Amino acid sequence: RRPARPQIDPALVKSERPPQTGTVFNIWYNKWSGGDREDKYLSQTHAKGRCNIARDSGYTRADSRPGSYFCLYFARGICPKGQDCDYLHRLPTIHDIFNPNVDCFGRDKFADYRDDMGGVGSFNRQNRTIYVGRIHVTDDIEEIVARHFAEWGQIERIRVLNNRGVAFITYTNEANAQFAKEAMAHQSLDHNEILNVRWATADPNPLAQKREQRRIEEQAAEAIRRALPAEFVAEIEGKDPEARKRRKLESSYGLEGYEAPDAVHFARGPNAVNPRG
């Protein structure tokens, strides 16, 4: 196979104070204080590393352990440990699904979003949409976005609102969306720019609204079809005429003209009167 490639040498990776934006370093909050509030957020700098999945992937001390999360700093391109990292150093696949309390890196997801909408995210929205802006406004935005927003996962839909320099990338997997957000933030696309890859809000386009509502509905339908027996659900939709005939003949129980209610017929238990389960 192949061990995980050390991305940045440990000589360049330290743990130092942020640049001095004040007079006194507050050590409880680890933040500079003093100066003027005209500085405040200042600007978003350029990150110290990008990722090549074909070059930086490998095995760590995490493929041996089931349930290990992906690495935030391998996604950020600045993980020096290589094969000695305790987290996975590979790309999230399509079967890498996670519960609605953590991301793919194991950070805890929150109740609501933050106003400056970034960070880990919230579990009250299955958000697979990433909002990227601050793109150098040219005519070939779509090709370079589709080339560079493609090595992080499998993609459903990229709508490039050109002229504004804004795109909304929807992956099919939420973990891939989180990986792309943590990988492309403060990166460069073709020229020296800082990309503002943040969590997308909700597309007000009613077509997108009904698409998302429908997709939620067949996700829940898939869960219910997994829960219910195959004959039960096959009678439940009733698109098959033979299943309809089976419902008419079976839901009689001797008494004619009954057409037994769904509470009695579609019931599961040891004492139910049905083939049960």
Partner 1 sequence: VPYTGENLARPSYGPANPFKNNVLTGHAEEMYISEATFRAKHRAVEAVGGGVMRSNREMKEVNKRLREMREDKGSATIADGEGAYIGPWARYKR
Partner 2 sequence: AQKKKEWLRMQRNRFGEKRKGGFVETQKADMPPEHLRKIVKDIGDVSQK
Partner 3 sequence: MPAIRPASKRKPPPDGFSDIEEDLLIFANKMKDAQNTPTDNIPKHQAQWPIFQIAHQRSRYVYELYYQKQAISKQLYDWLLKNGYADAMLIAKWKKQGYEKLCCLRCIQTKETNFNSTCICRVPRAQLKEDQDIQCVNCGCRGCASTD
Residues in contact with partner 1 by CB under 8 A are: 263-264, 267, 269, 271-273
Residue 14 binds what, of partner 2, partner 3, partner 1, none (CB under 5 to 8 Å, by partner type)?
partner 3
30 binds, among partner 1, partner 3, partner 2, none (CB under 5 to 8 A by kind): partner 2
| Burial call 52-63: b when 16+ CB within 10 Å, e when fewer | eeeebbbbbebe
Q: Interface with partner 3 includes 61 (CB under 8 A)?
A: yes
User: Under the criterion CB under 8 A, does residue 10 sit at the interface with partner 3?
Assistant: yes
Residue 175 has phi, psi (to 5 degrees) of -65, -35
Q: How far is the CB of 120 from partner 2 (least distance, A)?
A: 18
**Minimal CA–CA distance to 155: which of 180, 123, 183?**
180
Percent of the chain as helix, strand, coil, to the nearest 5: 25, 10, 60
- Name the minimum Å distance from CB 72 to partner 3: 15
Q: Which is nearer to partner 3, 45 or 64 (CB)?
A: 64
Q: Which does 119 bind (CB under 5 to 8 A by kind): partner 2, partner 3, partner 1, none?
A: none
- For residue 125, give the DSSP letter: S
Task: Give the span between the Cα atoms of 201 and 113, in whole angstroms.
Answer: 10
Q: Residue 158 or 236: which CB sits closer to partner 1? A: 236
What residue 27 binds from partner 1, partner 3, partner 2, none (CB within 5 to 8 A, per partner kind)? partner 2
Nearer to partner 2, 73 or 199 (CB): 73
**Closer of 161 and 223 to partner 1 (Cβ):** 223
| Residue 88: φ, ψ to 5° | -70, 145
The CA distance from 55 to 27, in Å, is: 39
Q: Which is nearer to partner 1, 161 or 272 (CB)?
A: 272
Least CB distance to partner 1 at residue 252 (A): 16
148: which 2 tokens?
A: 């560079």
Distance in angstroms (rounded) separating the CA atoms of residues 40 and 265: 65
Give the HSE-up count for residue 33: Cα atoms under 13 Å, Cβ half-sphere. Answer: 8
Interacting positions 13-52 with partner 3 (CB under 8 A): 13-15
- The listed partner (partner 2, partner 1, partner 3, none) that binds 220, CB under 5 to 8 Å by sort, is none
Q: Which does 137 bind (CB under 5 to 8 A by kind): partner 3, partner 2, partner 1, none?
A: none
58 within 8 A of 5, measured Cβ to Cβ:
yes
